[PDB]
Design a protein around this ligand. Structure first.
Ligand SMILES: NCCCC[C@@H](N)C(=O)O
Lengths: 437, 429
């Protein structure tokens, strides 16, 4: 019952990556897994047109940007730095939209090159309008619809928890500022033209929740008759572990596309749709590849067997940050599929950082508790593969903690060959900006 | 009224760091606060000697290292990379202790230079013994005493921890026979299970840790590790080094009387040395509102989890103060406002004012009324912030670090990273 491969790495393909990266740890990305997600998103049900934007904050490697560009997938940038980064990878400016918490001081330069801006607060709209007064520049507007992920918590707001929308969220402009005239007054003051509305409150895999997401956001498109595009954001869930449900884009897409048809039947306007998936595009396409460098034991009550890797929260932080479980497969350090065998052992996986919280197998949703996974019996030198690590891992980790170098990145082509796309960082590069004093 | 200053920055001094750094965000370190912490640690009560090691994993800046080195403070490194990094800052090899989860493949090269190694596993002790078999080597042993912080959760000791060698492998001959099979000389013992502020607990920590130096008569040093608690927020208790050290020093006296050996003591403060000595200096670049049930006023900083992760990672509260953006203390005023503070990352969890221990729940702080452009200073951020953050998330460059001397002058110790450097190691095709 031992897995003969991981989500996309056989024992032969894993050693091929390690050789290309000069050792462990490393990030492995599979072109095959990127093509499945790209095609699945480009097949999203739409009524009058679809645009897929990659939320590059999930994984900003230029090869990933170049690949999604070749598939006619656009880019959703989270800051002026991501805008300038995507343009370095060859993405044209017009294919980038900027939705940020911090409007960069050089936003006007980006807008001039063709970058579409989604104003995310009153302050950003006014700064945009001050610079392009009476012209009247087109701009996007992100709205906080007044509700977030969960509805009204099946009762009243309840506890004020973090959310992508609602009264406990700082994202977007509060919906009451749209309906009380505050935002339309700013638009008229600077002669702006609102061409696009942006929302981001979708979650789960319920088609009837996504239809309500669309209906509510579309109601803001009738406030500004010049709007021609509706950006519904991301949030499509990916089930990394067995039993968890991945969102079916065809099942939730058709009620969304019908909500677009109902708008065109009640308003007479056929709107372009946009989606901003981050996790759904790159999550299962990436995997952390590390080696078991040590194996220790405790005895007595609450004792465990610990597998210590040469990686950790420096490379995958989601276990420590959320208590997220990742699929884990242990392959023979020989690289031969004949040495997989059929021996299992329940273990706890820990990271190489000298920190108690550097745990790789936590209890679901509780990063302070231990949990054991039944894996292949591992000797020192065997490869551990953490799958589903292509989103918010390389692009969001505590790199250089304990002064560990930033892990390299490898691309595995459709033929099973490994290509290095980011060389390992050197030690001196970690403190190359320090100044003597 | 409102605070006319932060823990160590006035509006004028804060503007000085911003000038020296080119803008916000930035880390600021106080030479004064480092000096105050260095003296308290160097005054730890001891019976027969004390060595203070800075756990550089909390802030590895070379100026911080050079400073502690000038104060006779040694280094506790947690990886082969930190050992070399500390050596690049001018720290001798002999002033470095290596206690790491991951033994580097070039560890023999570090040991020959003078670096002292504490084996944290049977595997490590065996790899050390195989390379130095019968050559008169000396080594330390890090022992899991069998109890963590309780004198199933993640702990620094006990059956739940992977640090380090399980005590039952020492008391059943296994570790003794490894040392004897390779001709090793166990030089010191290493534990790290102390916590809190109770001197009775610290005395139980020292006694149980000293019971393992009985197994190896060659032991001359006893490293009790770190974990000295720092209360960043007003009302929280900071460990009194003087009152917990008197019962610990008595344990060394009781060991010398009954066992006949006067052991040297070592401590590894990390948080205690640098936490209060550093602050995150940022700018309020936006301010938004909501209405209705559980509505809030939000301050959007130009920093976030990319710079200070402890709020999101632990739900840890940090002391916060707001200064006028003009930099003139005459502009502090008397106006206040309860606000939620959020970072600049497009992330629902980039909260900077969470509930204590619940990083997903919002909890407002009463601060000075903030206009866009004002300065927010987050104190208690010199430990596990610049040395432990999600930098380059949303491609934000690594923030600069500034040192503030005794005369109030700001000195740049790390320039702001450029966008190009964030992906200077990427290869095409
Ligand atoms: N804010 C991040 C939340 C991650 C949720 C996780 N279950 C996923 O599917 O990606």
């Amino acid at each position: 019952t031992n897995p003969l491969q991981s989500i996309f790495l056989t024992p032969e393909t894993a050693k091929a990556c390690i050789d290309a990266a000069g050792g462990t740890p490393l990030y492995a990305y599979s072109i095959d897994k990127l093509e499945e997600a790209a095609d699945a998103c480009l097949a999203f049900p739409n009524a009058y047109g679809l645009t897929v934007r990659y939320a590059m904050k999930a994984c900003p490697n230029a090869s990933i940007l170049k690949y999604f560009h070749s598939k006619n997938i656009h880019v959703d940038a989270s800051s002026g730095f991501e805008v300038r980064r995507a343009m370095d990878a060859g993405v044209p400016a017009e294919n980038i939209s900027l939705s940020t918490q911090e409007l960069p001081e050089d936003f006007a330069a980006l807008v001039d090159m063709g970058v579409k801006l989604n104003a995310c607060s009153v302050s950003q709209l006014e700064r945009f309008g001050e610079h392009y007064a009476g012209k009247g520049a087109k701009v996007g507007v992100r709205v906080n619809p007044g509700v977030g992920s969960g509805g009204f918590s099946a009762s009243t707001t309840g506890f004020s928890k973090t959310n992508v929308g609602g009264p406990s969220s700082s994202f977007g402009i509060w919906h009451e500022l749209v309906t009380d005239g505050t935002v339309p007054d700013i638009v008229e003051r600077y002669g702006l033209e609102v061409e696009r509305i942006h929302t981001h409150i979708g979650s789960g895999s319920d088609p009837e929740i996504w239809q309500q997401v669309a209906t509510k956001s579309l109601s803001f498109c009738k406030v500004f008759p010049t709007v021609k595009t509706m950006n519904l954001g991301g949030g499509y869930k990916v089930g990394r572990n067995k039993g968890e449900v991945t969102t079916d884009l065809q099942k939730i897409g058709k009620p969304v596309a019908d909500a677009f048809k109902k708008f065109a039947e009640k308003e007479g306007r056929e709107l372009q749709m946009e989606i901003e998936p981050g996790t759904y595009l790159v999550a299962m396409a990436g995997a952390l590849v590390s080696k078991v460098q040590d194996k220790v034991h405790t005895t007595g009550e609450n004792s465990h067997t610990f597998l210590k890797l040469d990686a950790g929260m420096t490379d995958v932080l989601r276990p420590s940050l959320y208590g997220a479980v990742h699929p884990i497969t242990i392959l023979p350090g020989s690289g031969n599929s004949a040495d997989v065998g059929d021996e299992t052992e329940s273990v706890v996986v820990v990271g190489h950082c000298c920190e108690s919280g550097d745990l790789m197998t936590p209890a679901p949703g509780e990063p302070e508790q231990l949990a054991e996974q039944e894996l292949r019996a591992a000797a020192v030198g065997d490869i551990l593969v953490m799958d589903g690590s292509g989103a918010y891992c390389s692009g969001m980790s505590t790199k250089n903690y304990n002064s560990f170098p930033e892990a390299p990145e490898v691309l595995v082509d459709k033929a099973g060959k490994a290509h290095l796309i980011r060389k390992r960082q050197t030690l001196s590069q970690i403190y190359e900006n320090e100044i003597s004093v």
